[PDB]
Scaffold this active site. Sequence first.
Site, PDB file in Angstrom:
ATOM      1  CE  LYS C 140      -3.715   2.276   2.608  1.00  0.00           C
ATOM      2  NZ  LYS C 140      -4.587   2.219   3.816  1.00  0.00           N
ATOM      3  CG  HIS C 259      -5.554 -13.289  -6.987  1.00  0.00           C
ATOM      4  ND1 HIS C 259      -6.843 -12.911  -7.147  1.00  0.00           N
ATOM      5  CD2 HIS C 259      -5.082 -12.613  -5.934  1.00  0.00           C
ATOM      6  CE1 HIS C 259      -7.144 -12.023  -6.205  1.00  0.00           C
ATOM      7  NE2 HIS C 259      -6.090 -11.835  -5.466  1.00  0.00           N
TER       8      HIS C 259
END
Lengths: 150, 149, 418, 415, 128
Positions: C140, C259
Amino acid sequence: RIPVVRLKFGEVAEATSVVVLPVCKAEEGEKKILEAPMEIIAGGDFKVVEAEKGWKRWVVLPSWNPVAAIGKGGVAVSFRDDRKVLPWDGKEEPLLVVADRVRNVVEADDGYYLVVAENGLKLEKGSDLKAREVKESLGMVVLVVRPPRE
Amino acid sequence: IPVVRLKFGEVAEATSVVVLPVCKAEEGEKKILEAPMEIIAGGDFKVVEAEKGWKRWVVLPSWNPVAAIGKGGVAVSFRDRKVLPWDGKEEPLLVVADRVRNVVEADDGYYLVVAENGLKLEKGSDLKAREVKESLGMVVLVVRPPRED
Amino acid sequence: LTYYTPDYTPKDTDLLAAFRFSPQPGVPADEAGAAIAAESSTDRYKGKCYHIEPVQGEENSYFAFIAYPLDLFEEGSVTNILTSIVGNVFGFKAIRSLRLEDIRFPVALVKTFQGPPHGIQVERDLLNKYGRPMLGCTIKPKLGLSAKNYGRAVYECLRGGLDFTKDDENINSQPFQRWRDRFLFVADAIHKSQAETGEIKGHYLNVTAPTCEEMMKRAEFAKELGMPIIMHDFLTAGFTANTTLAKWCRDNGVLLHIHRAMHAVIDRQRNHGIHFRVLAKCLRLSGGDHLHSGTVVGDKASTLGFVDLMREDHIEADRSRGVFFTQDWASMPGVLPVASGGIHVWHMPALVEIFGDDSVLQFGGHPWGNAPGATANRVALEACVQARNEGRDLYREGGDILREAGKWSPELAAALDL
Amino acid sequence: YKLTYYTPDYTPKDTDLLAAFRFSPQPGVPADEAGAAIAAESSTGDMDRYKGKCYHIEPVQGEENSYFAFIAYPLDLFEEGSVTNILTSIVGNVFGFKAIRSLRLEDIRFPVALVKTFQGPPHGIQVERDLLNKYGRPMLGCTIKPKLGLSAKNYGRAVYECLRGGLDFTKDDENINSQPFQRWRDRFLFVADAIHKSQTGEIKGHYLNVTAPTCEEMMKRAEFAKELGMPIIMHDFLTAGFTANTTLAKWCRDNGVLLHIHRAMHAVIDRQRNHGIHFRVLAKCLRLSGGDHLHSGTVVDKASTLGFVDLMREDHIEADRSRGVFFTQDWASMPGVLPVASGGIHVWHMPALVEIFGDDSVLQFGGHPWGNAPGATANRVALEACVQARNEGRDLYREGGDILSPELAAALDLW
Amino acid sequence: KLTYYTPDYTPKDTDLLAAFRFSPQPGVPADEAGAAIAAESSTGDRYKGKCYHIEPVQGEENSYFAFIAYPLDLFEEGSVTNILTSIVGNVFGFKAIRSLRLEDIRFPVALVKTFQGPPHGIQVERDL
């Protein structure tokens, strides 16, 4: 307004921490709240506890963070009907109100304080009490508990 | 029979009412034989109801063994026993016992019985060796005071 | 009801599927059962419904067990199996809703698939990581960062103690950041953080791409840079592309991370669509060494159910865990589960006990930046693993295990300030 | 944080991607809060340049606890030319979000700036008409039954009969890619022979299925079809994947092979009305990826179907909520896709199908009492009758029974 | 030998089976010879062959059959050359047996499906 966390059905499966509060009732009145033991001595291992005064009624509450924070001076008040006590809307159900007598002084304008009303016991906003110059209250409401339902 | 710290929110699976009448070890079997068995949370107020009044009340958070007990729930304070005062004293104790499971059936399971002074916990096998097929309560968990450190 | 036989025993070479459905009012379970078999298979080539057991509790809700002959499936192809079983069976009027709960792949079919490029044991050997679960995290800010600053974040996190750092699944190549530059700066970050610790570290470079060729170019570049692992979205990109990449990975020695973005579209509701455990089996056959499973603490039984299905060699049927059929994997390697979502060090005890050692935990905001972040998780995990080895109870003592470790580690002590 | 992802005054830019969602929030959760959450989870969960914004929320008329939310996303968040990236971002994990009971994606507005980064259909409608030299009418075809268990030679014979008999296209069953009882290489040879010996004096083809387990195998099959001179191939894009589909579409443009797209799995994703992704979204996504033909299914809600048929054929579609079109969509001269109607249809329904779909369509039929060539004949006749009648101005719904060589009669007599 | 000859074993659906004929050196028991064949042709607990049945060749002195199972995992998928080195690589040179002949092999379905098989086969060929 008032923080309200509702007890729910099936919550008995795995409570990791739980706290104990004496119980006072609307019918019992302000006197009972003064009478209730304020200091609960934690000599606990996984909870063992003793109270400064003997008390007939006890409610077992989960360690919700607001309830856990109180520690000493924690009481639970039973109300037959939610509407009379709650300034806002009610569901016509029994109400459990957790109050901290330590913060009874009215300093929080938005804070709700249990007080002796003419009819019985009521929760009043701090600003309103300040308008009437009421410096002290029975207890400062920390949490309102609502009953499990279907 | 787990030993758990009184610690907040370790497992996140749901929180609610549970209660046990407390006895002291020094009190003996008489206190255990008299503590109220049925502690019933109800109405909507949820104030707990006991068939009889008890002096000392402790709750054990609804961990799985505690929830399983239901009737016969009891909590037993136990106090130590240091040869040397400077050597750290062992902590105070509490025993969650199912008085409903009085009968001794499990060798592994510990069972509450009476010591010469106070009460004691004895293995089921040891009790069967001593020919006691009965005990006051069956211990379902062990203690340890909250350690924020 | 020519497609429903109340008394039939499946052959060892049959593929079995378990469906759950709710009939339109007026339609008997028997007919719905037969209809599912007919629509999905059309005598040697027809499927047969052989059991229509009701589900307890729910009204107008039934199961159907359908056998399909081995010869209806293309060897080695997930795409074909799914097309044949779930393509249009979900679209007809006799049924209000339909969900696929499980598939039994016969050994005879399992052996025609590649399976995971490396599998759990090989993957540990390649990474030289044993005894414990692996750790990782993500970065992030996600969007809007330059490749260089991104590379710095990767470096710090890995240098700090994580095994893996993961790319945002949503960033393949974008105007604000191009994939080639990201790959170069990340690779540098890895090489430096690896060199300074003496241990293998990776980064899940995203090689998802719009075409098969572009996907290979991205994968080839990652290989040139010495990257041990790459990632791909098997559902959005799809199985043809996923299978191709898995084959490439085996040939080149690159680990593959899968994923599960967009799985919710297919399996979120419980009364229609395809249960994740089916997709998990399909993926084990297609390829992929690591797979996002999602966490438990940040249904428990059904989750544990598929985790065993994708790791164990032999799983006995057990309806209480969501496993309908006994599945023999014929010595095909397993897929390492990846836990994620809402997790941080407070949940470390549970995560270790729930998943065991053969897993990856993908965390995440630490008070003192990224390396302290990584440090705190590394410590919390090792503390939990060791306690479990000793015999301590992670579901009860977990609070103390973390606090003792916190006292030892300022980074962890800060992390535990919750 | 909970809010600011909802900005009621925001007006969308010409370059924004817009999406329309329907949802039902968990009890206790406000509609606006839920809307903001969708925007956050789908974009961020200088960041203000990289975040989505919910700009409008309104209730679904007639439904309790059911709302719409309109969310804008900046152009910069989407990889040029990639359907996979667009979907990965938009529908990646928002559907798993805890404050919402259910979520469904109804529509996407693709800004011109993004539309122009995509290839679009390999050929499109006008090019296809010219390649095939077929004008003034819908095209016809059918599937072959028996499906499984046929030798390549017998399969080829069935194909031959149907094509010679009057159909334009014959389709491979979607469940037969390559099987132990039939290997694709032989199917391809025998089908190609059937085309050769039929192709009448007009172009005909067969939708050879090149869906395959790997990208390489897919190309290998497609290349063989090219060597044999096959004008068209097909692919199951929702089971194979958009990456594979896009690759095949590029191949097709380079090699001049028409591409047929079969929905093949959509009921899994779009059937239930309160969860998942509406077909019209997938239809737009496909038009951008590739494909000249797309199964739409038949009509014989109606409004919703008509809505996406225009979206995938027209250059400019005005928003019209009654047809399920939420946003005005400008396709910037990208070619359209021919809809393919199928399932539950016969010559009996030909009038309606012609009037509903117009000329820019393909009608696929599933048996006739006399073998197969009379089948093909009956459909060819029924279609021409319908087209000529429509040209005359006749009412194809009211006069349909009059509008519809005893081959056609045998079909009409049967039903 | 007691780790190789197991008289009460039932073969699995995925086992590869082989049937051998042999004549043991004089003074060599048939069972010992059978166990040896299984050992020489496999590791020698899930990577070993097992001799499950031994019987005399009717009408032939000093001549026996032995039936040996081999786990699926001992064979490379799709490879004839691997199957053969595993089964016939060196067992024929084993000293306690005068002569050894391989009569038959059962290929389990699970293994058969890993092979291409004939490029076209009988029906395709007639059609071509």
